[PDB]
Symmetry: C2
Subunit: 99 residues, 2 copies
DNA sequence: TGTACTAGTTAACTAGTAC
DNA sequence: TGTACTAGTTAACTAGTAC
């Protein structure tokens, strides 16, 4: 349950980040808290979710576009199935235009 | 460039996209479900540990070996924290001391 | 004391296959 | 066609050492 404790501290980080966006110090905050590799992997996961939601490529086509492993697409697929409907509709609105 | 340098710049842009989608998520109260979708459980937990280290290194009331023992961490993680703080803008450091320190 | 180093551990990754 | 699987690699981690 060292885990339960690390969970309450994660929530604290979410809160700090919220306050950083409000003061224009999100970038520097993220550069301190994440590693280069982690930032690159997050950039990728956003491309994956956006193209799954657009639905114009098969998952095989998408992994070849990205140079990703098919399991990584699958992770994106499975994570979208677990997300609340309101989030998925919100992403389709924002990612697929208008914003 | 027609090479390496340019490739780095693109990865950069894809990351800024994540930063902008999260901002928009906070404005709509969808930040939590968004971060549960975009990170893994092991990733959230690590972040939690990194914020505790930054806070305690700011505080300056515990030695580094003391911090490591408290958290069940390797001293090299504490070092990463220390070197990162050293590379941060002064402005960020001032704000963190301001928010975490007292408030916490 | 702070911080550079060595080792093995762990989980997200790319590459490819089974239905 | 999507998705559950098998491999090996990568990088942040814990544990421990040398100045
Ligand atoms: N919550 C997911 C996080 C994640 C890992 N890889 C991904 C691929 C794309 C989207 C999300 C993911 C487990
Ligand atoms: N920007 C750092 C991120 C980081 C990795 N490990 C850490 C430990 C504590 C604080 C920051 C971190 C590289």
């Amino acid at each position: 349950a060292m885990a339960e404790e690390r969970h309450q501290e994660w929530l604290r980080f979410v809160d700090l980040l919220k306050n950083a966006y409000q003061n224009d110090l999100h970038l520097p905050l993220l550069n301190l808290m994440l590693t280069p590799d982690e930032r690159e992997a997050l950039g990728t996961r956003v491309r994956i979710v956006e193209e799954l939601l657009r639905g114009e490529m098969s998952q095989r086509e998408l992994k070849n576009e990205l140079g990703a492993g098919i399991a990584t697409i699958t992770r994106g697929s499975n994570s979208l199935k677990a997300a609340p409907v309101e989030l998925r509709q919100w992403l389709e609105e924002v990612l697929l235009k208008s914003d």
